Amino acid sequence: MKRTPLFEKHVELGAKMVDFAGWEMPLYYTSIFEEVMAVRKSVGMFDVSHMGEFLVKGPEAVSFIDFLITNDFSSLPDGKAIYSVMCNENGGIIDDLVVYKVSPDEALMVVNAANIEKDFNWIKSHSKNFDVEVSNISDTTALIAFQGPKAQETLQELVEDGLEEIAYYSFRKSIVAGVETLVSRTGYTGEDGFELMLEAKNAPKVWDALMNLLRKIDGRPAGLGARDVCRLEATYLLYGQDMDENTNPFEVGLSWVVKLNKDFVGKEALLKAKEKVERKLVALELSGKRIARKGYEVLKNGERVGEITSGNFSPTLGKSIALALVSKSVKIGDQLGVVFPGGKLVEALVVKKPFYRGSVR
């Protein structure tokens, strides 16, 4: 499996390793629940160096990005990032991502680990008519997520610039624990927090410095187990589980990242798609302790209405929770049934999204 520049650190901390998108990653260090608690109460630090980063440099960086993504990038000012999806000609989601507008001549794209190759090939196969050069810097770049209600007050000590100034989804080049870092107020937890992008060679030192601070505030390093629990609670999506090329943005609650007033790949397909949205992604709270998994059939009074996309147990709400892609007819308050292996039906209630809103700005 692929190894992050922090692999040795994880093993040393005694984390239980798991395979994620071909990467050898920490499922947890102590326990999934203790790590989720850390994120919800103090600080949870995640190694997300498996994420990919692409650089788009050139006079037409802005137009190129605006052409590739569904969200409006042509308006973003320097130092601002944007969440979006990138669609194919048929409106299918190739991947969701975050693009940083460094300057009119430079944009940075952070994409999902499992999609680095697919994404990069797609982006490069579309740079032809744009005065830009696209490069993949993933191989030498690391990314650390410092998340929690106490993330800022804890991290400040090591950052030479004021974190307060950095607004939600804004970023700034600064120095962290003595190394150049691209610091953004972004996250996947539902709590306040930042992501620290840096040269892979400097990841070990930054991680150790941060670990030092965590022990002081009773925070903790957090693995993929806690990452999935927190993102699901926050009701954020995970490409491949909740959406893929067989779903368009409107079907999974991402209409807000699609701006049809501009031109982009998949535009025409999406105009038509918007006219007939036949599916939706709903939040479910199941009865019992069993966790629903992707693919489990979801029924309404005995008739199929869709299927589970993501499932897990939320210690924050003390409930088995799930996301499910179902027919447009399903509404909040409905009593559904989830078919577990062996045909066992488990009751589920449709609830308003998101399950939980923390300290995120």
Side-chain angles (χ1 to χ4, degrees), residues 85-124:
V85 153
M86 191 170 288
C87 297
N88 57 35
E89 218 55 59
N90 292 307
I93 303 175
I94 298 174
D95 200 6
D96 63 331
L97 39 24
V98 174
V99 183
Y100 297 44
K101 172 169 283 187
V102 178
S103 73
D105 292 67
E106 185 182 308
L108 189 164
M109 312 174 80
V110 181
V111 304
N112 289 296
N115 299 314
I116 296 176
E117 289 303 301
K118 183 182 71 165
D119 289 0
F120 194 61
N121 284 165
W122 175 260
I123 296 178
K124 265 192 169 179

mmCIF file of all heavy atoms in Angstrom, residues 85-124:
data_model
loop_
_atom_site.group_PDB
_atom_site.id
_atom_site.type_symbol
_atom_site.label_atom_id
_atom_site.label_comp_id
_atom_site.label_asym_id
_atom_site.label_seq_id
_atom_site.Cartn_x
_atom_site.Cartn_y
_atom_site.Cartn_z
ATOM 1 N N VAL A 85 -18.026 20.452 -7.357
ATOM 2 C CA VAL A 85 -17.987 19.142 -7.963
ATOM 3 C C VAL A 85 -17.458 19.423 -9.360
ATOM 4 O O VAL A 85 -17.492 20.563 -9.825
ATOM 5 C CB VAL A 85 -19.393 18.500 -8.037
ATOM 6 C CG1 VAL A 85 -19.462 17.519 -9.187
ATOM 7 C CG2 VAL A 85 -19.703 17.779 -6.730
ATOM 8 N N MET A 86 -16.935 18.389 -10.004
ATOM 9 C CA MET A 86 -16.420 18.475 -11.358
ATOM 10 C C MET A 86 -17.250 17.397 -12.047
ATOM 11 O O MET A 86 -17.238 16.242 -11.615
ATOM 12 C CB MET A 86 -14.934 18.114 -11.355
ATOM 13 C CG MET A 86 -14.185 18.408 -12.627
ATOM 14 S SD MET A 86 -12.404 18.197 -12.353
ATOM 15 C CE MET A 86 -12.069 19.601 -11.361
ATOM 16 N N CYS A 87 -17.979 17.765 -13.098
ATOM 17 C CA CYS A 87 -18.836 16.801 -13.791
ATOM 18 C C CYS A 87 -18.370 16.414 -15.188
ATOM 19 O O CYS A 87 -17.576 17.121 -15.805
ATOM 20 C CB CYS A 87 -20.262 17.356 -13.916
ATOM 21 S SG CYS A 87 -21.162 17.667 -12.371
ATOM 22 N N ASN A 88 -18.870 15.282 -15.683
ATOM 23 C CA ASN A 88 -18.544 14.856 -17.038
ATOM 24 C C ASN A 88 -19.603 15.473 -17.951
ATOM 25 O O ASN A 88 -20.480 16.202 -17.483
ATOM 26 C CB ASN A 88 -18.544 13.329 -17.173
ATOM 27 C CG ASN A 88 -19.861 12.692 -16.772
ATOM 28 O OD1 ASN A 88 -20.936 13.251 -16.991
ATOM 29 N ND2 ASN A 88 -19.781 11.495 -16.198
ATOM 30 N N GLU A 89 -19.530 15.181 -19.244
ATOM 31 C CA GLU A 89 -20.467 15.750 -20.205
ATOM 32 C C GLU A 89 -21.934 15.428 -19.905
ATOM 33 O O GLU A 89 -22.825 16.196 -20.264
ATOM 34 C CB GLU A 89 -20.106 15.283 -21.620
ATOM 35 C CG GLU A 89 -20.284 16.354 -22.686
ATOM 36 C CD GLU A 89 -19.521 17.631 -22.368
ATOM 37 O OE1 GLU A 89 -18.279 17.574 -22.230
ATOM 38 O OE2 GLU A 89 -20.166 18.695 -22.253
ATOM 39 N N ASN A 90 -22.179 14.303 -19.238
ATOM 40 C CA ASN A 90 -23.543 13.892 -18.907
ATOM 41 C C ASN A 90 -24.043 14.377 -17.549
ATOM 42 O O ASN A 90 -25.114 13.966 -17.096
ATOM 43 C CB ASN A 90 -23.660 12.369 -18.974
ATOM 44 C CG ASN A 90 -23.517 11.838 -20.386
ATOM 45 O OD1 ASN A 90 -24.216 12.280 -21.300
ATOM 46 N ND2 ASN A 90 -22.612 10.885 -20.573
ATOM 47 N N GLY A 91 -23.279 15.252 -16.903
ATOM 48 C CA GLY A 91 -23.690 15.772 -15.609
ATOM 49 C C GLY A 91 -23.320 14.888 -14.430
ATOM 50 O O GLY A 91 -23.659 15.198 -13.286
ATOM 51 N N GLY A 92 -22.639 13.782 -14.709
ATOM 52 C CA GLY A 92 -22.220 12.868 -13.660
ATOM 53 C C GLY A 92 -21.058 13.453 -12.882
ATOM 54 O O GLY A 92 -20.224 14.170 -13.441
ATOM 55 N N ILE A 93 -20.995 13.159 -11.589
ATOM 56 C CA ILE A 93 -19.929 13.690 -10.749
ATOM 57 C C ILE A 93 -18.649 12.869 -10.820
ATOM 58 O O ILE A 93 -18.609 11.704 -10.417
ATOM 59 C CB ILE A 93 -20.372 13.791 -9.277
ATOM 60 C CG1 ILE A 93 -21.625 14.670 -9.182
ATOM 61 C CG2 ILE A 93 -19.239 14.367 -8.429
ATOM 62 C CD1 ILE A 93 -22.232 14.749 -7.783
ATOM 63 N N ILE A 94 -17.603 13.498 -11.339
ATOM 64 C CA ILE A 94 -16.301 12.862 -11.466
ATOM 65 C C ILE A 94 -15.619 12.889 -10.106
ATOM 66 O O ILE A 94 -14.920 11.948 -9.728
ATOM 67 C CB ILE A 94 -15.461 13.597 -12.523
ATOM 68 C CG1 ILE A 94 -16.171 13.485 -13.879
ATOM 69 C CG2 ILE A 94 -14.057 13.025 -12.584
ATOM 70 C CD1 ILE A 94 -15.535 14.280 -14.992
ATOM 71 N N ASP A 95 -15.841 13.966 -9.359
ATOM 72 C CA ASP A 95 -15.266 14.088 -8.027
ATOM 73 C C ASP A 95 -15.725 15.398 -7.411
ATOM 74 O O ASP A 95 -16.198 16.290 -8.122
ATOM 75 C CB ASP A 95 -13.730 14.090 -8.109
ATOM 76 C CG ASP A 95 -13.068 13.740 -6.785
ATOM 77 O OD1 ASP A 95 -13.792 13.395 -5.835
ATOM 78 O OD2 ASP A 95 -11.820 13.797 -6.701
ATOM 79 N N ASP A 96 -15.652 15.496 -6.085
ATOM 80 C CA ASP A 96 -15.962 16.764 -5.458
ATOM 81 C C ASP A 96 -14.564 17.227 -5.071
ATOM 82 O O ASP A 96 -13.652 16.405 -4.955
ATOM 83 C CB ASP A 96 -16.939 16.631 -4.265
ATOM 84 C CG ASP A 96 -16.401 15.816 -3.105
ATOM 85 O OD1 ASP A 96 -15.571 14.909 -3.299
ATOM 86 O OD2 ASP A 96 -16.861 16.082 -1.971
ATOM 87 N N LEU A 97 -14.374 18.531 -4.930
ATOM 88 C CA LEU A 97 -13.056 19.051 -4.610
ATOM 89 C C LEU A 97 -13.092 20.458 -4.050
ATOM 90 O O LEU A 97 -14.148 21.083 -3.948
ATOM 91 C CB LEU A 97 -12.159 19.039 -5.862
ATOM 92 C CG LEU A 97 -12.690 19.391 -7.266
ATOM 93 C CD1 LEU A 97 -13.915 20.268 -7.214
ATOM 94 C CD2 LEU A 97 -11.579 20.074 -8.061
ATOM 95 N N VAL A 98 -11.913 20.939 -3.679
ATOM 96 C CA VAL A 98 -11.747 22.279 -3.137
ATOM 97 C C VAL A 98 -10.670 22.955 -3.966
ATOM 98 O O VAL A 98 -9.564 22.426 -4.095
ATOM 99 C CB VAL A 98 -11.289 22.249 -1.664
ATOM 100 C CG1 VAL A 98 -10.981 23.667 -1.189
ATOM 101 C CG2 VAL A 98 -12.370 21.628 -0.795
ATOM 102 N N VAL A 99 -10.990 24.116 -4.530
ATOM 103 C CA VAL A 99 -10.021 24.843 -5.345
ATOM 104 C C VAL A 99 -9.630 26.150 -4.658
ATOM 105 O O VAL A 99 -10.491 26.902 -4.200
ATOM 106 C CB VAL A 99 -10.595 25.158 -6.744
ATOM 107 C CG1 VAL A 99 -9.536 25.841 -7.605
ATOM 108 C CG2 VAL A 99 -11.065 23.864 -7.414
ATOM 109 N N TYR A 100 -8.325 26.408 -4.592
ATOM 110 C CA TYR A 100 -7.803 27.621 -3.964
ATOM 111 C C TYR A 100 -7.420 28.643 -5.027
ATOM 112 O O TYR A 100 -6.673 28.320 -5.951
ATOM 113 C CB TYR A 100 -6.521 27.343 -3.173
ATOM 114 C CG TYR A 100 -6.594 26.401 -1.994
ATOM 115 C CD1 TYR A 100 -7.302 25.198 -2.056
ATOM 116 C CD2 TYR A 100 -5.868 26.677 -0.836
ATOM 117 C CE1 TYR A 100 -7.271 24.297 -0.993
ATOM 118 C CE2 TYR A 100 -5.832 25.785 0.227
ATOM 119 C CZ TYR A 100 -6.533 24.599 0.143
ATOM 120 O OH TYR A 100 -6.470 23.719 1.195
ATOM 121 N N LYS A 101 -7.911 29.870 -4.902
ATOM 122 C CA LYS A 101 -7.527 30.901 -5.852
ATOM 123 C C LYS A 101 -6.359 31.660 -5.230
ATOM 124 O O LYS A 101 -6.548 32.562 -4.416
ATOM 125 C CB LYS A 101 -8.680 31.864 -6.141
ATOM 126 C CG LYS A 101 -8.242 33.055 -6.985
ATOM 127 C CD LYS A 101 -9.405 33.879 -7.494
ATOM 128 C CE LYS A 101 -10.106 33.207 -8.672
ATOM 129 N NZ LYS A 101 -11.140 34.099 -9.282
ATOM 130 N N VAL A 102 -5.149 31.263 -5.601
ATOM 131 C CA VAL A 102 -3.944 31.897 -5.091
ATOM 132 C C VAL A 102 -3.789 33.269 -5.738
ATOM 133 O O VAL A 102 -3.533 34.265 -5.057
ATOM 134 C CB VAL A 102 -2.707 31.040 -5.408
ATOM 135 C CG1 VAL A 102 -1.442 31.724 -4.908
ATOM 136 C CG2 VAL A 102 -2.861 29.670 -4.765
ATOM 137 N N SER A 103 -3.949 33.308 -7.058
ATOM 138 C CA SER A 103 -3.833 34.549 -7.819
ATOM 139 C C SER A 103 -4.461 34.317 -9.187
ATOM 140 O O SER A 103 -4.844 33.197 -9.521
ATOM 141 C CB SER A 103 -2.357 34.923 -7.997
ATOM 142 O OG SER A 103 -1.733 34.062 -8.935
ATOM 143 N N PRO A 104 -4.569 35.370 -10.009
ATOM 144 C CA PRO A 104 -5.171 35.144 -11.325
ATOM 145 C C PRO A 104 -4.372 34.152 -12.172
ATOM 146 O O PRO A 104 -4.901 33.559 -13.111
ATOM 147 C CB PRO A 104 -5.216 36.548 -11.931
ATOM 148 C CG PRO A 104 -4.053 37.242 -11.275
ATOM 149 C CD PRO A 104 -4.170 36.777 -9.841
ATOM 150 N N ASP A 105 -3.101 33.967 -11.830
ATOM 151 C CA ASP A 105 -2.249 33.045 -12.573
ATOM 152 C C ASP A 105 -1.978 31.734 -11.845
ATOM 153 O O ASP A 105 -1.150 30.945 -12.291
ATOM 154 C CB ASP A 105 -0.910 33.707 -12.910
ATOM 155 C CG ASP A 105 -1.053 34.837 -13.907
ATOM 156 O OD1 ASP A 105 -1.663 35.869 -13.556
ATOM 157 O OD2 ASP A 105 -0.556 34.693 -15.045
ATOM 158 N N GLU A 106 -2.660 31.489 -10.731
ATOM 159 C CA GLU A 106 -2.419 30.249 -10.002
ATOM 160 C C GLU A 106 -3.595 29.760 -9.174
ATOM 161 O O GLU A 106 -4.121 30.483 -8.336
ATOM 162 C CB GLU A 106 -1.204 30.399 -9.088
ATOM 163 C CG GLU A 106 -0.814 29.113 -8.374
ATOM 164 C CD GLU A 106 0.361 29.299 -7.434
ATOM 165 O OE1 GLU A 106 1.399 29.832 -7.873
ATOM 166 O OE2 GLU A 106 0.247 28.909 -6.253
ATOM 167 N N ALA A 107 -3.984 28.516 -9.419
ATOM 168 C CA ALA A 107 -5.081 27.881 -8.702
ATOM 169 C C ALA A 107 -4.574 26.520 -8.244
ATOM 170 O O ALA A 107 -3.793 25.876 -8.945
ATOM 171 C CB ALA A 107 -6.283 27.710 -9.624
ATOM 172 N N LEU A 108 -5.002 26.095 -7.060
ATOM 173 C CA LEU A 108 -4.591 24.807 -6.520
ATOM 174 C C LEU A 108 -5.847 23.981 -6.280
ATOM 175 O O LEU A 108 -6.801 24.458 -5.673
ATOM 176 C CB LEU A 108 -3.821 25.007 -5.216
ATOM 177 C CG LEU A 108 -3.120 23.794 -4.601
ATOM 178 C CD1 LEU A 108 -2.112 24.282 -3.580
ATOM 179 C CD2 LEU A 108 -4.126 22.855 -3.956
ATOM 180 N N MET A 109 -5.834 22.743 -6.756
ATOM 181 C CA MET A 109 -6.986 21.857 -6.630
ATOM 182 C C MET A 109 -6.679 20.705 -5.684
ATOM 183 O O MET A 109 -5.701 19.988 -5.882
ATOM 184 C CB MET A 109 -7.350 21.294 -8.010
ATOM 185 C CG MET A 109 -7.440 22.349 -9.111
ATOM 186 S SD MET A 109 -7.712 21.645 -10.752
ATOM 187 C CE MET A 109 -9.474 21.344 -10.670
ATOM 188 N N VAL A 110 -7.504 20.533 -4.654
ATOM 189 C CA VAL A 110 -7.305 19.432 -3.715
ATOM 190 C C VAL A 110 -8.404 18.418 -4.027
ATOM 191 O O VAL A 110 -9.595 18.730 -3.933
ATOM 192 C CB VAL A 110 -7.406 19.921 -2.255
ATOM 193 C CG1 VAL A 110 -7.165 18.762 -1.294
ATOM 194 C CG2 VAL A 110 -6.388 21.023 -2.021
ATOM 195 N N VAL A 111 -8.000 17.213 -4.418
ATOM 196 C CA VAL A 111 -8.954 16.172 -4.793
ATOM 197 C C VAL A 111 -8.825 14.933 -3.921
ATOM 198 O O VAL A 111 -7.879 14.808 -3.143
ATOM 199 C CB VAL A 111 -8.762 15.766 -6.273
ATOM 200 C CG1 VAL A 111 -8.878 16.997 -7.162
ATOM 201 C CG2 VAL A 111 -7.396 15.099 -6.467
ATOM 202 N N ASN A 112 -9.781 14.016 -4.056
ATOM 203 C CA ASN A 112 -9.778 12.792 -3.270
ATOM 204 C C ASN A 112 -8.744 11.764 -3.700
ATOM 205 O O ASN A 112 -8.508 11.559 -4.893
ATOM 206 C CB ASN A 112 -11.171 12.167 -3.283
ATOM 207 C CG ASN A 112 -12.154 12.968 -2.471
ATOM 208 O OD1 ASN A 112 -12.000 13.095 -1.258
ATOM 209 N ND2 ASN A 112 -13.156 13.533 -3.133
ATOM 210 N N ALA A 113 -8.154 11.108 -2.703
ATOM 211 C CA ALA A 113 -7.126 10.092 -2.909
ATOM 212 C C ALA A 113 -7.435 9.063 -3.996
ATOM 213 O O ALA A 113 -6.629 8.843 -4.898
ATOM 214 C CB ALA A 113 -6.845 9.374 -1.586
ATOM 215 N N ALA A 114 -8.599 8.427 -3.905
ATOM 216 C CA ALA A 114 -8.981 7.408 -4.874
ATOM 217 C C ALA A 114 -9.148 7.946 -6.292
ATOM 218 O O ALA A 114 -9.137 7.178 -7.255
ATOM 219 C CB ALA A 114 -10.274 6.718 -4.422
ATOM 220 N N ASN A 115 -9.272 9.263 -6.429
ATOM 221 C CA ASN A 115 -9.481 9.853 -7.744
ATOM 222 C C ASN A 115 -8.357 10.689 -8.338
ATOM 223 O O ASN A 115 -8.555 11.349 -9.360
ATOM 224 C CB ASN A 115 -10.758 10.693 -7.721
ATOM 225 C CG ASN A 115 -11.978 9.870 -7.395
ATOM 226 O OD1 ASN A 115 -12.166 8.783 -7.944
ATOM 227 N ND2 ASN A 115 -12.818 10.378 -6.505
ATOM 228 N N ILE A 116 -7.177 10.656 -7.727
ATOM 229 C CA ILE A 116 -6.074 11.459 -8.238
ATOM 230 C C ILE A 116 -5.766 11.205 -9.716
ATOM 231 O O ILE A 116 -5.686 12.146 -10.502
ATOM 232 C CB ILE A 116 -4.789 11.235 -7.410
ATOM 233 C CG1 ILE A 116 -5.013 11.712 -5.971
ATOM 234 C CG2 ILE A 116 -3.636 11.995 -8.039
ATOM 235 C CD1 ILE A 116 -3.847 11.446 -5.038
ATOM 236 N N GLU A 117 -5.598 9.940 -10.093
ATOM 237 C CA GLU A 117 -5.292 9.598 -11.481
ATOM 238 C C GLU A 117 -6.420 9.983 -12.427
ATOM 239 O O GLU A 117 -6.192 10.656 -13.431
ATOM 240 C CB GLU A 117 -5.000 8.101 -11.614
ATOM 241 C CG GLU A 117 -3.676 7.683 -11.006
ATOM 242 C CD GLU A 117 -2.502 8.438 -11.601
ATOM 243 O OE1 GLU A 117 -2.307 8.362 -12.834
ATOM 244 O OE2 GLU A 117 -1.776 9.110 -10.837
ATOM 245 N N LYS A 118 -7.633 9.544 -12.106
ATOM 246 C CA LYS A 118 -8.804 9.853 -12.919
ATOM 247 C C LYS A 118 -8.970 11.365 -13.066
ATOM 248 O O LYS A 118 -9.159 11.877 -14.173
ATOM 249 C CB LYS A 118 -10.064 9.267 -12.279
ATOM 250 C CG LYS A 118 -11.317 9.499 -13.106
ATOM 251 C CD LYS A 118 -12.574 8.948 -12.448
ATOM 252 C CE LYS A 118 -12.983 9.766 -11.239
ATOM 253 N NZ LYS A 118 -14.378 9.450 -10.826
ATOM 254 N N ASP A 119 -8.905 12.079 -11.946
ATOM 255 C CA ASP A 119 -9.052 13.534 -11.975
ATOM 256 C C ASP A 119 -7.968 14.220 -12.798
ATOM 257 O O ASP A 119 -8.262 15.046 -13.663
ATOM 258 C CB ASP A 119 -9.018 14.115 -10.560
ATOM 259 C CG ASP A 119 -10.262 13.794 -9.753
ATOM 260 O OD1 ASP A 119 -11.176 13.112 -10.267
ATOM 261 O OD2 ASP A 119 -10.321 14.236 -8.588
ATOM 262 N N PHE A 120 -6.709 13.892 -12.520
ATOM 263 C CA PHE A 120 -5.607 14.518 -13.238
ATOM 264 C C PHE A 120 -5.703 14.300 -14.746
ATOM 265 O O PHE A 120 -5.476 15.226 -15.529
ATOM 266 C CB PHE A 120 -4.263 13.994 -12.727
ATOM 267 C CG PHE A 120 -3.096 14.819 -13.170
ATOM 268 C CD1 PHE A 120 -3.004 16.158 -12.802
ATOM 269 C CD2 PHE A 120 -2.093 14.269 -13.958
ATOM 270 C CE1 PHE A 120 -1.928 16.941 -13.218
ATOM 271 C CE2 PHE A 120 -1.012 15.042 -14.378
ATOM 272 C CZ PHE A 120 -0.932 16.381 -14.006
ATOM 273 N N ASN A 121 -6.036 13.081 -15.156
ATOM 274 C CA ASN A 121 -6.168 12.778 -16.579
ATOM 275 C C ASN A 121 -7.316 13.581 -17.190
ATOM 276 O O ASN A 121 -7.230 14.052 -18.328
ATOM 277 C CB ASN A 121 -6.418 11.283 -16.780
ATOM 278 C CG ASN A 121 -5.163 10.456 -16.601
ATOM 279 O OD1 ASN A 121 -5.227 9.234 -16.458
ATOM 280 N ND2 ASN A 121 -4.010 11.116 -16.618
ATOM 281 N N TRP A 122 -8.391 13.734 -16.426
ATOM 282 C CA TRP A 122 -9.550 14.484 -16.891
ATOM 283 C C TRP A 122 -9.193 15.956 -17.046
ATOM 284 O O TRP A 122 -9.490 16.577 -18.065
ATOM 285 C CB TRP A 122 -10.710 14.332 -15.897
ATOM 286 C CG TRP A 122 -11.906 15.162 -16.235
ATOM 287 C CD1 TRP A 122 -12.257 16.363 -15.685
ATOM 288 C CD2 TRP A 122 -12.900 14.867 -17.223
ATOM 289 N NE1 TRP A 122 -13.409 16.835 -16.269
ATOM 290 C CE2 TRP A 122 -13.826 15.936 -17.217
ATOM 291 C CE3 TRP A 122 -13.101 13.802 -18.112
ATOM 292 C CZ2 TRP A 122 -14.936 15.973 -18.066
ATOM 293 C CZ3 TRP A 122 -14.206 13.838 -18.959
ATOM 294 C CH2 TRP A 122 -15.109 14.919 -18.928
ATOM 295 N N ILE A 123 -8.545 16.515 -16.033
ATOM 296 C CA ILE A 123 -8.169 17.916 -16.080
ATOM 297 C C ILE A 123 -7.180 18.207 -17.207
ATOM 298 O O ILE A 123 -7.328 19.197 -17.925
ATOM 299 C CB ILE A 123 -7.602 18.363 -14.717
ATOM 300 C CG1 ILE A 123 -8.708 18.245 -13.662
ATOM 301 C CG2 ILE A 123 -7.071 19.782 -14.803
ATOM 302 C CD1 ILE A 123 -8.295 18.600 -12.249
ATOM 303 N N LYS A 124 -6.185 17.344 -17.381
ATOM 304 C CA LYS A 124 -5.205 17.552 -18.446
ATOM 305 C C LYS A 124 -5.794 17.346 -19.834
ATOM 306 O O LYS A 124 -5.357 17.971 -20.796
ATOM 307 C CB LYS A 124 -3.997 16.629 -18.267
ATOM 308 C CG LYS A 124 -2.842 17.287 -17.530
ATOM 309 C CD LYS A 124 -1.568 16.464 -17.631
ATOM 310 C CE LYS A 124 -0.367 17.251 -17.119
ATOM 311 N NZ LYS A 124 0.898 16.463 -17.175
#
